[PDB]
């Protein structure tokens, strides 16, 4: 099987659990490699309509287990590129501490559900390093330049509620409610028109990399595709029937 | 005349009213075409110093009246390009429901005045489609990536006050106050240095598409232009006279 | 010496004080030139680990002392490029009114500490001009498109607490506390791993100008550099010693 993570499809959600609980799920070469493979697996599997990444144990992910360039390009780049190109929704279920590259991973996901005991630690600066695995590409796109610099430079840990105030949490979930609310959010996404969700992620990528004029040409192509989909014709037949749509993801 | 919209200059404001009230001002081929023409008209008219877009009836615009690519490139692209290149200020006076491409249109305007009964519905996903007519180009530039994805993916309707909290409303206006506050806001803009306002819109476009170094060269050119303007010399003569400036828009 | 500014290194912080108090520290050709030189000086000095820019007297900077293009390209462009390429942290200690290009200068800094009596005045529009010296490049990257347009177009002055609400202040400092809190914030930064801070500023620049794929290659190169640094090996030796790290900035 996988050795540093757990990959389990339950219903139509792939549960990707980071699994080195004694080391707070800190990344190693094979965790990096397994996460990459699992993300590509989830992307290729027609039965997978949502992905959840969460940590085993008390923490979400403490980042690198403690040439830095080579570490990044050989281990982290393939993983972050797989995540970045994955066209299924991905929820970071941040069950506890996310620090370093663990914070990076959470920022790269589409939704972040923070348990009431979770926290984000942009800890790189305290060992004289820079935020990495994509951190400074994502962070200002979520919080603007000033807050991203403050986080990266001052390195101060943020609580779940402080993360929510910053715009870094989709929601904060009480501990007793954790397992059920996470599952319901993931199942709720896994029931939506998955192909339209992938195309909107594609378009959000286009939005950050292209000009307005070219963007509209990309958009029109995405909509020709969504429009041909079975889910679209279910959505229209259910609207024009005062009925609840049943979507399949194609 | 125009048949699906009303275009009326009152004072120095062009009132562009979307006018298919029985279908909640939903777009058709000729509404798309008329809005395009009217925006270009307003842009070319030296007497027009502000534009207001609003909906007749209860709603602002319910979006497409219900090949998707061809629909977008042939109808919506010319309209959104006309809006995007228009260098006069444009206020979306969102009098009621804005859904689908109606929400898109509102996001593309410079200011959004929401009546207390208005709402934004990113409804595309519920029929298995993607937000379009520029939606995902504008939205993350207003609310950041995470909130834009949440809106696009979960598709949940937002109230006027929730839109204001998200940074999607310039202000929320009580119903009894609606007609007067909208007119005063538009007249207030129509009295400002319209040529400087067009150049700042030009520069905001440059800001999103160019690098810092090139940006400064674009800025210097815009300021040479604003500096030659009659409005600039009125502004300086009124400052150095403890007086209220009277601007003409050139 | 310098004539329109004061440049003084105290400890490891360069205090760059704008110094035309009778004209509210408004820029002239030689203030522009001196600030440029001083920023490059601070950047080249291994003993300087933080920069503070503040105004002498009651105001921070009222902007241009009252061909606009030539003014910008010959005076302001070199100054803003020096600031933009400076890889040491720069705090704008906004002691009072920042208006016009004075507001521009504050937005270009990494942190903005506002005294309780400071204010930001995007005043350009009231003389028929556009916000300049980089204003519209920085501003939407801090507050999003809508608020940047509202500020630029309506030109309404904002209080310290309103700036904090907008995301334009790192913090608001009471008047009695001003001198000490500013010094402690600057000294606190001057003690951090300055080379990692410069590399994160480099990466924030890369983040706004490059694509995701290229960004990761830039990041890996920055981290190879931070990783070789003496500060990094101090940070690791102090973590693995339950000890407070002592950083030198190399």
CB-side neighbour CA atoms (13 Å) of B133: 26
* Angle at CA of residue C72, ends C66 and C75, nearest 5°: 85
CB-CB: which of C141, C196, C203 is closest to A128?
C196
Distance from CA of A108 to the nearest CA of C (A): 12
Contact present, A116 and A78 (Cβ < 8 Å): no
Cβ contact (<8 Å) for C232 and A127? yes
Contact present, C135 and C75 (Cβ < 8 Å): no
Structural domain boundaries in chain A = 1-192, 193-250
- Residues A48-61: b if buried by 16+ CB within 10 A, e if exposed: bbbbbbbbbbebbb
Ordered DSSP codes for A137-182:
HHHHHHHHHHHHHHHHHH---EEHHHHHHHT--SEEE-GGGHHHHH
Contact present, A194 and A230 (Cβ < 8 Å): no
Residues C144 and C26: their CA atoms lie apart, in Å, by 28
Looking at the complex, does the CB of residue B184 fall below 8 Å from at least one CB of chain C?
no
Residues of B in contact with C133 (CB under 8 A): 219
CATH architecture for segment(s) A1-192: Alpha-Beta Complex (3.90)
Chain C residue with the nearest C-alpha to that of B220: C69
Chain B residue with the nearest C-alpha to that of A232: B128
Cβ contact (<8 Å) for C126 and B208? no
Which residues contact residue B246 at a Cβ distance below 8 angstroms, ignoring those fewer than 6 apart?
B234, B238
CB-CB: which of C203, C215, C235 is closest to A126?
C235
Could you tell me which residues are beta bridge partners of residue C25? none
Which residues contact residue A181 at a Cβ distance below 8 angstroms, ignoring those fewer than 6 apart?
A113, A173
Residues C75 and C82: their CA atoms lie apart, in Å, by 12
B10 in helix, strand or coil?
strand
Contact present, B223 and C74 (Cβ < 8 Å): no
Chain C residue with the nearest C-alpha to that of A127: C235
Task: Quote the longest CA-to-CA distance of chain B.
Answer: 61
Cβ contact (<8 Å) for B207 and C137? yes
CB-CB: which of A195, A224, A231 is closest to B68?
A224
Contact present, A32 and A71 (Cβ < 8 Å): no
> Which segments within chain C are labelled E, that is strand?
5-10, 13-18, 50-55, 90-94, 97-99, 111-115, 119-121, 158-159, 171-173
Cβ contact (<8 Å) for B140 and A138? no
Cβ contact (<8 Å) for C223 and A69? yes
Cα A128 to chain centroid, rounded: 27
CB-CB: which of C72, C127, C208 is closest to B232?
C127
A58 in helix, strand or coil?
coil
Chain C residue with the nearest C-alpha to that of A155: C192
Domain C193-250: CATH class, spelled out: mainly alpha
Distance from CA of A97 to the nearest CA of B (A): 20
Element (H, E) at A6: strand A5-10
Chain C residue with the nearest C-alpha to that of B138: C145
Of C82, C14, C85, the closest CA to residue C45 belongs to: C14
A123: left (phi over 0), alpha (psi -120 to 50) or beta: alpha
Cβ contact (<8 Å) for B111 and C150? yes
> Residue C240: exposed, middle, or buried by beta-carbon count in 10 A (0-12, 13-18, 19+)?
exposed
CB-CB: which of C66, C69, C147 is closest to B167?
C147
CB-CB: which of B124, B131, B144 is closest to A141?
B144
Looking at the complex, does the CB of residue C68 fall below 8 Å from at least one CB of chain B?
yes
Looking at the complex, does the CB of residue B45 fall below 8 Å from at least one CB of chain C?
no
Residues of B in contact with A233 (CB under 8 A): 128
Q: Residue C153's CB: how many other CB atoms inside 10 A? A: 22
Task: Quote the longest CA-to-CA distance of chain A.
Answer: 61
Residues A14 and A6: their CA atoms lie apart, in Å, by 10
Q: Which two tokens stand for residue C129?
A: 């001009």
Cβ contact (<8 Å) for C111 and A149? yes
Residues of C in contact with A130 (CB under 8 A): 196, 199-200, 203, 219, 222-223, 226
Sign of CA dihedral B230, B235, B240, B241: positive
Cβ contact (<8 Å) for C149 and B226? no
- Residues B10-27: b if buried by 16+ CB within 10 A, e if exposed: eebbbbbbbbbeebbbbb
Q: Which of A145, A219, A232 to mutate to test the interface with B (most CBs of B within 10 A)?
A: A219
Distances (CA, A) of B70 to A223, B76, B111: 9, 9, 29
Contact present, B112 and C149 (Cβ < 8 Å): no
Of A26, A135, A121, A123, the closest CA to residue A84 belongs to: A135
Residues of A in contact with B167 (CB under 8 A): none
Q: Chains contacting C with at least 3 CB pairs below 8 Å?
A: A, B
Over the Cα atoms of chain C, what is R_g?
18
Q: Which two tokens stand for residue C227?
A: 């990783």
Residues B113 and B96: their CA atoms lie apart, in Å, by 11
Chain A residue with the nearest C-alpha to that of C221: A69
Residues of B in contact with C152 (CB under 8 A): 200, 204
Cα A235 to chain centroid, rounded: 26
Q: Which two tokens stand for residue C88?
A: 């040491």
């Amino acid at each position: 099987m996988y050795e540093t993570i757990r990959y389990e499809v339950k219903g139509q959600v792939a549960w990707l659990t980071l699994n080195r609980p004694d080391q707070l799920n800190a990344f190693t070469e094979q965790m990096n490699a397994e996460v990459t493979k699992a993300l590509k697996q989830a992307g290729a599997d027609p039965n997978v309509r949502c992905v959840v990444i969460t940590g085993a144990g008390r923490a979400f992910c403490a980042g690198e287990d403690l040439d830095h360039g080579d570490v990044l390009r050989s281990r982290y780049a393939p993983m972050m590129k797989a995540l970045h190109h994955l066209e299924k929704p991905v929820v970071a279920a941040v069950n506890g501490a996310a620090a370093g590259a663990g914070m990076s991973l959470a920022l790269a996901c589409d939704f972040r559900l923070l348990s009431e005991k979770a926290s984000f630690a942009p800890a790189f600066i305290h060992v004289g390093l820079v935020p990495d695995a994509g951190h400074l590409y994502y962070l200002p796109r979520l919080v603007g330049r000033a807050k991203a610099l403050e986080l990266a430079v001052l390195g101060e840990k943020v609580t779940a509620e402080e993360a929510a105030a910053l715009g870094l949490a989709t929601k904060v979930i009480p501990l007793s409610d954790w397992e059920e609310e996470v599952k319901q959010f993931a199942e709720r996404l896994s029931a939506m028109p998955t192909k339209a969700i992938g195309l909107i992620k594609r378009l959000l990528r286009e939005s950050e990399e292209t000009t307005f004029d070219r963007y509209l040409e990309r958009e029109a192509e995405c909509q020709r595709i969504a429009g041909l989909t079975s889910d679209h014709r279910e959505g229209v037949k259910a609207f024009f029937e005062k009925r609840k749509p049943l979507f399949q993801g194609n």
